A paper describes a structure:
Rhodopsin, the vertebrate receptor for low-light vision, is concentrated within the disk membranes of rod cells in the retina. Rhodopsin transforms the absorption of light into a physiological signal through conformational changes that activate the intracellular G protein transducin—a member of the Gi/o/t family—initiating a signalling cascade, resulting in electrical impulses sent to the brain and ultimately leading to visual perception. The structure of rhodopsin consists of seven transmembrane (TM) α-helices with an 11-cis retinal chromophore covalently bound through a protonated Schiff base (PSB) to Lys2967.43 of TM7 (the superscript values on amino acids containing the TM domain location refer to the Ballesteros–Weinstein scheme, explained in the ‘Residue numbering’ section of the Methods). A photon is absorbed by the 11-cis retinal chromophore of rhodopsin, which isomerizes within 200 femtoseconds to the all-trans conformation, thereby initiating the cellular signal transduction processes that ultimately lead to vision.
To characterize the structure of Batho-Rh, we collected TR-SFX data at the Swiss and Japanese XFELs from LCP-grown microcrystals of rhodopsin photoactivated under a regime in which laser-induced heating is low and in which we recovered high-quality difference electron density maps below the maximum activation using a femtosecond-pump laser with a 480-nm wavelength for three time delays of photoactivation of ∆t = 1 ps, 10 ps and 100 ps. As mammalian rhodopsin evolves along its reaction pathway, some of the observed changes will become more pronounced while others will revert. By Δt = 10 and 100 ps, the β-ionone ring and C19–C20 methyl groups still interact respectively with Gly1213.36–Glu1223.37 and the tyrosines of the Glu181ECL2 polar cage (Fig. 3e,f and Extended Data Fig. 7 (top)), while, for example, Tyr2686.51 and Pro2676.50 of TM6 relax to their initial positions.
Residue numbers in the entry:
A (entry chain A): 1 to 142, 147 to 229, 245 to 322
B (entry chain B): 1 to 142, 147 to 229, 244 to 322
Write the structure that this text describes.
Amino acid sequence: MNGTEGPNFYVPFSNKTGVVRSPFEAPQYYLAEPWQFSMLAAYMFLLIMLGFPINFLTLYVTVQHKKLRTPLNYILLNLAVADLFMVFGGFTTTLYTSLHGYFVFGPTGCNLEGFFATLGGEIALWSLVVLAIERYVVVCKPRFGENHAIMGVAFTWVMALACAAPPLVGWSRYIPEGMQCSCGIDYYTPHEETNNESFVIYMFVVHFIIPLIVIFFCYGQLVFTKAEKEVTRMVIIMVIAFLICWLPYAGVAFYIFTHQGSDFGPIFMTIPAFFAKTSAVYNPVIYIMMNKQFRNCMVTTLC
Amino acid sequence: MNGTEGPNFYVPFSNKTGVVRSPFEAPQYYLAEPWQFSMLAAYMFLLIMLGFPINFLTLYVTVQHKKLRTPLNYILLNLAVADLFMVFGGFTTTLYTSLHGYFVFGPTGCNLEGFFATLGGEIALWSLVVLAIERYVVVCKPRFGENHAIMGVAFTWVMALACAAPPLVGWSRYIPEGMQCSCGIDYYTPHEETNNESFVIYMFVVHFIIPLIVIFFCYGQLVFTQKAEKEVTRMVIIMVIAFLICWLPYAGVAFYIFTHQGSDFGPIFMTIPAFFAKTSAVYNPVIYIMMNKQFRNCMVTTLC
Ligand SMILES: *[C@@H]1O[C@H](CO)[C@@H](O[C@@H]2O[C@H](CO)[C@@H](O)[C@H](O)[C@H]2NC(C)=O)[C@H](O)[C@H]1NC(C)=O
Ligand SMILES: *[C@@H]1O[C@H](CO)[C@@H](O[C@@H]2O[C@H](CO)[C@@H](O)[C@H](O)[C@H]2NC(C)=O)[C@H](O)[C@H]1NC(C)=O
Ligand SMILES: CCCCCCCC/C=C/CCCCCCCC(=O)OC[C@H](O)CO
Ligand SMILES: CCCCCCCC/C=C/CCCCCCCC(=O)OC[C@H](O)CO
Ligand SMILES: *C/C=C(C)/C=C/C=C(C)/C=C/C1=C(C)CCCC1(C)C
Ligand SMILES: *C/C=C(C)/C=C/C=C(C)/C=C/C1=C(C)CCCC1(C)C
Ligand SMILES: *[C@@H]1O[C@H](CO)[C@@H](O)[C@H](O)[C@H]1NC(C)=O
Ligand SMILES: *[C@@H]1O[C@H](CO)[C@@H](O)[C@H](O)[C@H]1NC(C)=O
């Protein structure tokens, strides 16, 4: 191995010179200059300060205006809630971690960071599955109502927890990645005690490949066959934005899983891991730009 | 002396232990932990990312709408421009300096950071002077038009440069303060080669006390003597108050240091007032949006 494995960590840095310390015990300045940890903290502070108001204002405007009860309005409402969970539950630990250069909260902080970021990303993915069926049902007419949308909302939480929760209780585990200031799923070690390999295959199949198969099946029909046009256009951008956000992470995660112990450094996963955290803020932005009714209501309420 | 004087710095940290190093040569981790410097950089990064959009949008909306040509509109447009000089000309140096924990750009970086924040703050103060006279004439009619507003705009730049420029060319100097990641006027040392003592008196009298006397004179004449005019007077009251909240803590601590040179204070003493004052680049367009209905509608129109 070209890294350093400990009981609950894998540092992508060789301990041949003896300088590697646990990311739960001391600042990781042996693998990066302090000013680089400070950039990660400036970034996270931005995401929190931007992420909280824009998701709260999406939530506030939707509840205030009773005309926002289409299935799209419910789904965007649900995304704002999970985004708030990501900001307050996970990103506050990311900020404090990146400020101090290591996981000052110990493994409990690593679990919070990884869990809330995994949960929110999966709620967004399975939300895209719901919108793909609604668009397929309404446009093709093979009626999608409030009951269906509200059932879809509960479905996204169940699927997301089926992915985010097991690493909390012994199936795989959350481990620090990159510069050791964020946590994800353990793609790095075998660690048979927690049956790591079977979780990763289950995560990539059930909660990455299968949802994308559903989404692209439905769009395949719409391709191969005015207010609804506005909805369909927004859902196309949301699918594209999701892929830009998560594919770099997904690709590096899968490379590491199939090249365990190989020669990669700490920046390799740091950048796709922190870019993926923009997932907590981009969805309401698309909402404001591409939904005229929601934009008018936000302008009305805020002014 | 309870601090360490260098050729071009004064570190508020004793060198009896030998660890003090120049803020132009090495990170200043001997007087604060690295996570404390990271907070300054995170704070500076927020200000840059908020400061550029709201000032640029304030500029853009004002130019695009012919009906925003009152003296208030001209003064606010001029504040947006100066705020943008603060963000791009000075705050970018602050961000780099906080990230690395010392002035990697050396003395030139200290001059940019101090000059643009001093220039921006003083344009704001002399702008309040201009608005106080305009309100004074408007309410009492003892007329203030578009030529006067543009003349006032030019006046605020000349006065601000008469405060910020001399320290670039040998009357006083810009010097790091606090945790050594921002710069201000040298209240710390006598340094007779730059006649430090006379500049601070000139700054506090001409560029602090005289302007406040003018502002509060015109308010006092007004306090003892339609809808649109009342809206303008209300916003000017808030602008004066917001200036005092932003700058009085800094001016108070600066004047205390001037009169207690070499006394026992640490790096946090000036750091917090110095960085709080940097919010001056942001708050003025926010009052404008909240309290001017014509401007707010023109931005909603422009933005949507
Ligand atoms: C990296 O190597 C160093 C040096 O071998 C390890 O530090 C030693 O750890 C043992 C066990 O705790 C101590 O008894 C020694 O005294 C340590 N030596 C020194 C010089 O500190 C270190 O634990 C290794 N790091 C990791 C993460 O495994
Ligand atoms: C603070 O004190 C230290 C310790 O005396 C100074 O370091 C010395 O500086 C001289 C002048 O450059 C060198 O010749 C010595 O070799 C240094 N000694 C050590 C142990 O480093 C340091 O210059 C002082 N700092 C300030 C800002 O005055
Ligand atoms: C901790 C894990 C939790 C996982 C599970 C999360 C489930 C979230 C759903 C809540 C139901 C909310 C019901 C709100 C009902 C609103 C109904 C409405 O607005 O319309 C009514 C309409 O008349 C109909 O025909
Ligand atoms: C639809 C819009 C899509 C927009 C987004 C497109 C993303 C393209 C890149 C994906 C990441 C692929 C990761 C592959 C990593 C291979 C790295 C490798 O081989 O590097 C070895 C080296 O040793 C390491 O240090
Ligand atoms: C900074 C916090 C991070 C990087 C959290 C990571 C969370 C995951 C391991 C998420 C996995 C995925 C999604 C939520 C959507 C795309 C598919 C996955 C399985 C890669
Ligand atoms: C971080 C940048 C700083 C601290 C800039 C400092 C600027 C000054 C020296 C400002 C001076 C003043 C004003 C602009 C208004 C209030 C009165 C003064 C003279 C203290
Ligand atoms: C470590 O890196 C070298 C060079 O890239 C590689 O040949 C070796 O297989 C790596 N070790 C493991 C366990 O993959
Ligand atoms: C340094 O601090 C001590 C204690 O407050 C004080 O007695 C002394 O006068 C200070 N030195 C100077 C030069 O003010």
